[PDB]
Amino acid sequence: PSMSITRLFPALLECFGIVLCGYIAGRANVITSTQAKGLGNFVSRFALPALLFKNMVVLNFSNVDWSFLYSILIAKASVFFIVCVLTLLVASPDSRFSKAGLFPIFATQSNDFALGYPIVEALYQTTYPEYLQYIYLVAPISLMMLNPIGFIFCEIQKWKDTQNASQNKIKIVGLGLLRVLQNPIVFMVFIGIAFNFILDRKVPVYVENFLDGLGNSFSGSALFYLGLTMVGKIKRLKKSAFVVLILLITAKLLVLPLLCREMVELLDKGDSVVNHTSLSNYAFLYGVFPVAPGVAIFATQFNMEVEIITSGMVISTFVSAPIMYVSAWLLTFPTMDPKPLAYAIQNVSFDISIVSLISLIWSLAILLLSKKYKQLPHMLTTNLLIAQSIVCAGMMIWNFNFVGQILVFVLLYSSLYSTYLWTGLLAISLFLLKGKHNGDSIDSAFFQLTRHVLLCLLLIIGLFANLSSCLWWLPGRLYVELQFFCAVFNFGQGFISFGIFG
Amino acid sequence: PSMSITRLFPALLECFGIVLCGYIAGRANVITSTQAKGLGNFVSRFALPALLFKNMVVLNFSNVDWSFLYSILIAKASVFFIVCVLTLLVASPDSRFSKAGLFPIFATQSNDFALGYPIVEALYQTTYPEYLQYIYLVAPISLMMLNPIGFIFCEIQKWKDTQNASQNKIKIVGLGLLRVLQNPIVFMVFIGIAFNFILDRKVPVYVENFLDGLGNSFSGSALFYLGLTMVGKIKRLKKSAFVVLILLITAKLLVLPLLCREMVELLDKGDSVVNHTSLSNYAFLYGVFPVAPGVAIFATQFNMEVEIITSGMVISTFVSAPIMYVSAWLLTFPTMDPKPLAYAIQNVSFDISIVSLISLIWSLAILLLSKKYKQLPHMLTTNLLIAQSIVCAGMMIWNFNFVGQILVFVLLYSSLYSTYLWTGLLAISLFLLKGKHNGDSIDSAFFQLTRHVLLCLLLIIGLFANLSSCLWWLPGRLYVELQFFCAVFNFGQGFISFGIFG
Ligand SMILES: O=C(O)Cc1c[nH]c2ccccc12
Ligand SMILES: O=C(O)Cc1c[nH]c2ccccc12
Known about the structure:
Chains A, B: This is Lysosomal cholesterol signaling protein. 2 copies of one chain form a homodimer. Chain A is mainly α.
């Protein structure tokens, strides 16, 4: 296997569990916003620059696959160019430059170090250890190349807003370029590259432990700070702003990884098909990383589009977790024989039902302890979420004799079909308010008002799959992929119930 | 070699370099006191409990040397008992219980996790990997055993101060005992021990990455928070309080490690002399760890003796660094043949001259940029510190041909003897204000007012040592040990100049 895909769910649990820890700490006022800045300044000014310096000094530039960098970088430049040109065409005259600066940086700049690296490490540390290098190459080179352009557009806006001024272009270009130079990521990569040549790849033995201590502290500390900064950030956006945010998160989490995968396949004219495939799959995985928290920091510094950029960075972080898991497994399935593939979809189902059961217990606990379950539409919703919890427990049981199998099936498919029933009954309440057994097998199938609208929309968008999937077993490539998307939905429907009511 | 003693200086540079980073960040107001609490709450409530749980679940209790635990624990109980009984006898009636509570906890509770573990790891990870277990065993079991007694004395004081009350003993005992149970170290060790039995030693694969991320972030993050909390903490103490602080830091950093070493040699009646010697040396290294930052937190919570305890914890942290380095090398020398031992003292000299040169550059930079060097006694002091910087550079050169050797000697010993000259001339200003070459060898020898009083008081110790050393080589065990203490002084005299004027 090219990806150690089994290691991805443990790594996602590290990543988004530590982000959830920081979010819980901020929500519980264990760490207030003014206290969080100590972790943020530790992370950004000490742990991250030490991690960057360490890895840049160690880096074997004579063994880097430059065509991977070129590919991801051209893919990011493509999404940057598309989002920028399109924004200048679509946006209102008084704010087209603040948007044309921050929207392209949003759509291209990844959460490479905090979230990307634990995931790339998990997937590729053993199978393709060279892939861990390109986190430290891509992320800064792409800030260096793309961010000054977006900063230049924000400086143009700052100039334009300052209507009493009429000054010349070179201060605009210089000030935006100076802004990327002042980023620790950029200057520590220049410094680390310099010391890579000076020291060879060898960190001095007496400095090594110090850089290890700071660098190794970045991962958890940065994920936790990301959690803290996500508290109270999703402000209720206008309809247009929410559409723009959806477009930009789609640019980052769908268009960019598709273009990354395509660019690798265009430019990586090396021979080995497995190396080419794993590099293509890594390019996709790279594109799926959420928006860098630094973009929200730039937006705060300029005082421009900060609502959309912060909300979008938070939502991108959350939305990346399932997209990353789903994408990586989906890219691994082409390499798997049908028996390991059936195993794999049950592993996927177990993983999603773990997170969904946790999310459902929390959602139910809120709706029950708040006693909201007696009001409308919460009266129906709590039925749906109990039924979803029974679904997830059914899968965690099914992951671990013949009589138990038949019993656990009826638990799972009475509650599953019931969750579809409640999905429809719940949607309707918003409108009013306004074949044979097959025991010798591993898979199981073949035997408030506005927020509630969003839940029923997403759940109905999910519903397609287990409809088709069972009449089609009564096949081929798209069946095992939609078997996966209906398993994802069967067990992960509660995660959407949670993401909206938690 | 029982200790990988060469790894200790890199580890100390990690430990006290990251502490110095946090101190620099707090001094520069990169992180204000109110911002530092975010790092503190991350460290104490997430990264430390995850580290504890991880290591306690992994722990092979069927392979622990219980006699080491018994030894360190009885040594700590001995120092606790001595400091407690002696404090109740010596202290003034109105505060004898707050002191009898916090002074014994001070004298016994070590900075085990932030500072102790990187050092034990460095020294013993390869040679005696089992020694890393006892950090996680000793530290909580000693909180559990000794801290409730000291808390009980602080509760007795709180009761006594609350003169309108006359309540019964069982609330006092229960409330102090509840205070140790509420400590994350204690409850996560109970929880981790429980899950060690439940899970065997095997952390669940999907929880493992999460615990790794949080736990691995503790080391650097806790050292940095320790640095932040050390900013502005050494308040100018009374003469009596400074003597008491010196006695308590001597209890922690001298009496406790001596008793730990003795207790191991009393109780470790196993056979192998090298295992016995390395365990004895580890027991000493364990006793040398500075005071736990938690003691200052207890003192803040009780609002008792907080000045002495905080100052003492900061000074203990700083004083531990040289004592730890000096002690570990000194304990390694008995195992070394005279040629590796001569090598070793030059390695020691290089290490101390690195830190001292850094410290001297900073000290000089302050005295020069402040232009204090024109006032008294700074006029002489800046001469001393230039001469000390030339000494340290002389050693770093001597660590890396025959003509260069003769040149670098005269640099080193003109400046060394001159630093002794200025040591005397400087002390006097305070009172007024109020043999043959031997080129075939590796060692070099054988060819404000109140703060200034403290500086000159300690360089007297040093004038002493190098005196004896050369006239005697013009031998035996105490000579190679004092050869080391005069090398320590020759090159580390600038570090004392820095610790007082920086
Ligand atoms: O986007 C990144 O991965 C870099 C980064 C810079 N400052 C951060 C704070 C928290 C989490 C990640 C980062
Ligand atoms: O004393 C220890 O090593 C434990 C510890 C608990 N809270 C701390 C904060 C900073 C550094 C260390 C600790």
